């Protein structure tokens, strides 16, 4: 159904920001809230109905200590909705006081647009890991939207910070964050920045213009995530309908990327299937399996060859699946988007569970048992002694996420029928 | 000239698009509603 | 079309005027109260019905009427004009027709009734009174009943009484 | 037909002014009296017609012991009326004695617009409850035009005082006033100006200046009150046609009031409809059901979508009427008012009977018994003594509204066939 998309933090607010740009650029519309009148498809699937063939879009922007906030505003796209929803350290600890106090007035703004939906599906975060500001305030706004509403879904867009090296406090932010994020949040959509650095020195030889390059790759993802709801398709045009066969059980919910060039600057949908297997084309870099793939396409339809090269990847034994269930890649097509000027009429997409981001979590665990261990990378400012005078609800944090590696190792033998 | 004037006004194919249209976004709201019954309940969700 | 427009709009009036008595002022007064209430709604609603039908077709017919340069269709749009008028009056069915006419008749008697003494009448006004309750009740369910075609404000209005099924269960 | 509008009081002269003022802004008139020759609707409604493109409006303002009156004078909207109709305690008593002695020359001041009349059809009274002297002398004046004319309609706009709190003979004084309006009185518009308070509070952050824009809100009911007599309709373009349908019996004859934006610093009839049934969108503040209801809408005309709403609101099922008949919501559709500007071209209005007011009716009984045992708060002067030497007749008062509560609860029952 509907969807309200909250965004928050100097990066989400700029995939907000980006993705809504991309959608204005998809469907038949101005940027100042006009639909052209040279135009089928759906342009209601997030957008408040005004009358001057104004669809507003349905989001909610939150800012803290605002600087790139500011370059977003002067923007022909600011004129597209903004119903005046505007409102005013880098630890996780800042966050979380400030969004402490100010809680009720962001959340009336939101109890506003709430009952202007008539619909509702879920609610998606634009979130930033080790963002600063937008750490702390993310997780307790994700904290006060579960306790508020326990009949909606909540899917996070949250980078993984890792770019090979100073913020010393990280893996303590990380750590507290994943915590909510596990515990508080339904659907989690993870991608490394280290990997998207990797394609973007793959794709160009840049090195300082990473961030815009970025974005066009994100929001390239971000549309093949919609394309299947904001066009009318036939299954998981909701958002439950994609996420149910995608989480097996929630504490493996978190969901793995793809896209099929590598270079954006007949094949088959074999071909773009068999190499968004690779891990060289997966978007988020023992043996690990997956837990269950579903994968998208969008573009020159083969009516009959899909069940062909099913037949294919299958005696083609690239992915061997969960032991212990019937864990399946699975295949959905979709309208490849009008309206838009585009390269690659063929483009996939993949959502997976896959085991591999237990060592990134492992990763971030050892960094943070150093760092707790020689001890002078707490930062021992005023926030954090007023948020806990003893500091256990971090040792809290790295035993509940251990716990969950420990169930990430357990449901990667060939015997989870037992718990743990 | 007898195809030609069925397939524009008194156009059949058009009917026929519909009626694959009527199964197969729009109709998760109205499949929803019917699974939780009356022959007019039914008349309500299918005019919006 | 004239003759009947006008006996449902000369009752309307006359019901204002029992009103406008019974305001001014037991138990006799208030059950000529509620019947005075419960008979002003459909007497009021059939008038109203009338007018929809008037106001959506006179639309049709004026804008035929220019945007043709040729005789035939508006003679055409006089006969349609006619024939829908006609039909959503009721008065090419019978027996909906023969139920109306007897709430107009129930309201005249009433009227007068009430008019007739400005205190309470215990003296042959329960005999009247209970006659016609009974006989109001029985008429205002039946033609309900028939009504109860294929457009679109006809059907919506019937369901406005079924919001609380006060004509199925008189 | 013609209705000669009738103020009083403090207050209700306050709206007598405001509601002219406004109607002068509606109409394409000068403040001076002048009709505009960049000039369809009709301009006599309630309007005496001199010569000079001059429409002179019919109303009779009365005042005691004037302060705002002044203030009230020296306005350039003096100059549209003013037939020379100036004549000269916070009690109750005190209005009523006063009024007592003076009754003849104002009621001469009365037939002089009456003979001046040719077509009449009520008399509105701008009243206001325990506005001090406008309590008691209202009341004495509203039981001599019912004395006078038992051919005249009379409606009432008075307000509900109650501010969540000194003046301790209040509800003495409203006791007596209701009194007089549920027996004296064939039309009771009431509002609570704790409910406007709180949409003032809701639209604005204001404490101070609420009276200005209680004004405003105010305007815009009678305004609305009057559109379809103001300007051509088709029914209720008469008071009596309009009030006809509301009251079911003269017990139950008070009257709600609604206005469906909240702020005033496409959407369809229907959600205007289902959110003028919401009491927050209401604008007066067991299970209570309506009796009757009546709504009015001026703006975009949707031509078919009126009775396809009207479906919709049926099967919606957010209000169940009275059981012992048969009571809607009934539909009205006006003009939107042409020679003024107006932010949102859609606007509604509802009339009702609801039994939500006995409680406001049982809470001054409940203030009144509890003051009139104690004993300290009758105030004891020479007016109240002179009028009545053993208080008996608010004790005969206070019979009759507790009578009137057992009348509303016994509507409230799905029974009431039997009397009582």
Redesign the interface.
């Known amino acids: 159904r509907e969807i309200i998309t909250l965004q928050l933090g100097q990066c989400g607010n700029q995939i907000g920001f980006e993705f809504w740009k991309q959608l204005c650029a998809e469907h038949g519309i101005s940027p100042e809230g006009i639909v052209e009148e040279f135009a089928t498809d759906r342009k209601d699937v997030f957008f408040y109905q005004a009358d001057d063939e104004h669809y507003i879009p349905r989001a909610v922007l939150l800012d803290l200590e605002p600087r790139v906030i500011h370059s977003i505003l002067n923007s022909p796209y600011a004129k597209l909705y903004n119903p005046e929803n505007i409102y005013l350290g880098n630890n996780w600890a800042s966050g979380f006081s400030q969004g402490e106090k100010i809680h009720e007035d962001i959340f009336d703004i939101i109890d506003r647009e709430a009952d202007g939906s008539d619909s509702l599906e879920g609610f998606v975060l634009c979130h930033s890991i080790a963002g600063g500001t937008g750490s702390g305030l993310g997780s307790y706004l994700l904290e006060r939207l579960n306790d508020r509403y326990p009949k909606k879904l909540v899917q996070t867009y949250s980078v993984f910070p890792n770019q090979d090296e100073d913020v010393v406090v990280q893996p303590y932010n990380s750590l507290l964050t994943l915590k909510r994020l596990t515990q508080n949040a339904d659907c989690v959509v993870v991608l490394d920045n280290t990997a998207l650095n990797r394609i973007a020195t793959d794709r160009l030889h840049i090195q300082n213009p990473s961030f815009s390059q970025i974005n066009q790759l994100v929001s390239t993802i971000m549309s093949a995530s919609t394309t299947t709801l904001r066009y009318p398709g036939y299954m998981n045009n909701d958002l439950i309908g994609l996420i149910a066969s995608l989480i097996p059980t929630p504490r493996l919910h978190f969901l793995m990327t793809g896209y099929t060039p590598l270079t954006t600057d007949k094949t088959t949908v074999l071909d773009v299937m068999r190499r968004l297997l690779q891990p060289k084309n997966v978007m988020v870099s023992t043996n690990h399996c997956y837990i269950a793939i579903l994968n998208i396409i969008q573009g020159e339809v083969d009516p009959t060859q899909v069940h062909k090269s099913l037949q294919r990847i299958r005696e083609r034994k690239l992915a061997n699946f969960i032991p212990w269930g019937p864990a399946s890649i699975q295949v959905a097509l979709s309208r490849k988007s009008p309206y838009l000027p585009s390269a690659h009429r063929v483009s996939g997409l993949m959502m997976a569970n896959h085991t591999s981001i237990s060592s990134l979590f492992e990763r971030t665990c050892r960094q943070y048992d150093k760092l707790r261990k020689r001890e002078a990378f707490l930062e021992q400012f005023r926030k954090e002694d007023m948020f806990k005078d003893n500091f256990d609800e971090m040792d809290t944090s790295r035993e509940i996420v251990q716990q969950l590696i420990d169930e990430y190792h357990a449901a990667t033998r060939p015997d989870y029928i037992s718990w743990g | 000239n007898l195809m030609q004037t069925l397939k524009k006004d008194y156009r059949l194919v058009e009917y026929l698009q519909a009626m694959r249209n009527f199964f197969?976004?729009?109709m998760?709201?109205f499949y929803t509603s019917i699974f939780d019954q009356n022959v007019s309940?039914l008349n309500?969700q299918l005019?919006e | 079309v004239f003759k009947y427009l006008l006996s449902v709009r000369r009752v309307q009036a006359e019901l204002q005027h029992c009103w406008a008595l019974q305001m001014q002022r037991q138990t006799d007064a208030i059950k000529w109260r509620l019947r005075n209430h419960m008979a002003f709604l459909v007497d009021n609603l059939q008038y109203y019905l009338q007018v929809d039908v008037l106001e959506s077709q006179f639309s049709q017919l004026l804008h035929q009427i220019n945007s043709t340069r040729d005789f035939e269709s508006i003679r055409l749009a006089h006969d349609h004009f006619l024939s829908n008028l006609l039909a959503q009056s009721f008065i090419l069915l019978k027996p909906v027709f023969h139920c109306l006419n007897e709430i107009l008749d129930l309201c005249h008697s009433f009227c007068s009734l009430v008019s007739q003494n400005l205190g309470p009448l215990d003296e042959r006004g329960a005999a009247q009174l209970s006659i016609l309750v009974k006989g109001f009740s029985r008429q205002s369910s039946l033609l309900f009943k028939i009504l109860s075609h294929q457009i679109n404000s006809d059907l919506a209005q019937l369901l406005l009484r079924l919001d609380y099924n006060k004509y199925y269960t008189q």
């Open positions: 197969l976004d729009t998760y709201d309940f309500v005019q």
